[PDB]
Amino acid sequence: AGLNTAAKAKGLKYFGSATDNPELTDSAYVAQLSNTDDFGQITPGNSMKWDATEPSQNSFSFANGDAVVNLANKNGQLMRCHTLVWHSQLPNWVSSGSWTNATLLAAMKNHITNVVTHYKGKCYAWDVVNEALNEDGTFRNSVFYQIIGPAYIPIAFATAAAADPDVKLYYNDYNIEYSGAKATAAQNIVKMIKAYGAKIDGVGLQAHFIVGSTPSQSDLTTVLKGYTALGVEVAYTELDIRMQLPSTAAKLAQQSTDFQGVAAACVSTTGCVGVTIWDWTDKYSWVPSVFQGYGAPLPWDENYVKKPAYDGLMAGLGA
Numbered sequence: 001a002g003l004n005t006a007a008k009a010k011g012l013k014y015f016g017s018a019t020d021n022p023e024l025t026d027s028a029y030v031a032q033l034s035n036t037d038d039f040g041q042i043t044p045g046n047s048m049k050w051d052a053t054e055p056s057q058n059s060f061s062f063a064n065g066d067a068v069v070n071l072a073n074k075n076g077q078l079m080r081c082h083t084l085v086w087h088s089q090l091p092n093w094v095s096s097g098s099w100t101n102a103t104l105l106a107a108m109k110n111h112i113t114n115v116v117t118h119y120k121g122k123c124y125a126w127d128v129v130n131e132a133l134n135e136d137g138t139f140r141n142s143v144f145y146q147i148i149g150p151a152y153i154p155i156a157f158a159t160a161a162a163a164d165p166d167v168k169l170y171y172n173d174y175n176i177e178y179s180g181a182k183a184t185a186a187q188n189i190v191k192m193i194k195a196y197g198a199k200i201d202g203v204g205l206q207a208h209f210i211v212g213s214t215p216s217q218s219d220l221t222t223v224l225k226g227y228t229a230l231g232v233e234v235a236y237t238e239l240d241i242r243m244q245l246p247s248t249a250a251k252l253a254q255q256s257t258d259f260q261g262v263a264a265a266c267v268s269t270t271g272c273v274g275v276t277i278w279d280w281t282d283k284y285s286w287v288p289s290v291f292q293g294y295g296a297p298l299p300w301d302e303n304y305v306k307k308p309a310y311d312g313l314m315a316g317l318g319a
């Protein structure tokens with residue numbers, strides 16, 4: 001019947017989509033987001049980030065995050081919860097602070113404990129740390145790395161696990177889906193977390209790809225299995241395949257094969273639990289505001305009509 005029914009028939013836990021709170025007032029949008037043939041899982045694109053949830057220190061705010069959970073609960077959809085520790089979308093008090101290791105650690109741990117406890121029981125997975133790596137596999141020089149050093153990563157995981165021992169704890173990043181220094185360094189993050197004694201359950205592969213320049217099915221699968229070999233699960237967490245505009249029939253067809261290989265890579269790898277696309281309609285994609293000249297990245301167009309990529313995904317899921 002749809003992406004989620006097809007995914008589950010192949011043993012995946014879900015096919016799902018991100019969304020954001022302004023979109024939930026569009027009734028036609030909501031109807032399709034709520035179609036559980038296509039979506040069995042929801043990620044909040046923004047309302048669980050640090051700026052949204054802890055706008056002042058020790059002053060938490062959950063209305064917007066909770067509204068997305070409420071919609072998923074209404075529909076019987078799973079949640080992925082996104083994201084606890086990240087260098088972007090920090091409130092001013094974090095980025096402007098004069099910190100020591102002890103005072104930033106206390107603020108970081110408090111952030112994690114409060115947000116995870118609030119959502120205890122409500123999330124399939126958390127993206128506990130997001131985008132901790134440079135492209136060469138060194139650590140990104142965020143405020144957390146500058147002040148705390150590499151230990152911020154396992155400390156974040158351990159803190160989340162203490163607050164909610166049941167939820168799957170993920171490391172999430174982009175450009176870790178293809179073979180290379182960054183992917184290898186993501187494997188090393190998994191190893192480091194476990195060497196500290198902290199828990200890590202999954203690797204989240206953002207999968208912000210480019211039409212005609214998407215990793216091949218074979219490389220995607222080698223990379224997925226490089227993580228599942230480590231005793232973790234994997235998921236594609238933010239899948240979109242941006243095209244260099246303008247859109248054409250030929251580009252739409254290439255986009256379909258590109259999406260097909262992603263889905264098929266996941267099915268081929270036991271331990272790949274699911275795919276989430278980063279929203280579902282071109283109308284609401286983040287891409288054009290960030291990648292000048294690119295767009296049309298998703299399986300439905302800006303009029304909410306399926307594109308060839310929808311069929312590519314179904315074919316990769318063996319439906």
Ligand SMILES: O[C@@H]1[C@@H](O)[C@H](O[C@@H]2CO[C@H](O)[C@H](O)[C@H]2O)OC[C@H]1O
Binds near residue numbers: 174175206208210
């Ligand atoms: O802010 C980051 C973006 O920088 C990140 O951009 C990458 C860059 O490397 C790639 O071309 C990949 O396709 C893009 O997504 O994307 C995630 C975002 O949070």
Ligand SMILES: *[C@@H]1O[C@H](CO)[C@@H](O)[C@H](O)[C@H]1NC(C)=O
Binds near residue numbers: 147149151
């Ligand atoms: C910060 O302190 C924790 C001990 O609580 C430690 O694991 C970490 O390595 C320290 N980092 C720095 C730069 O001192």
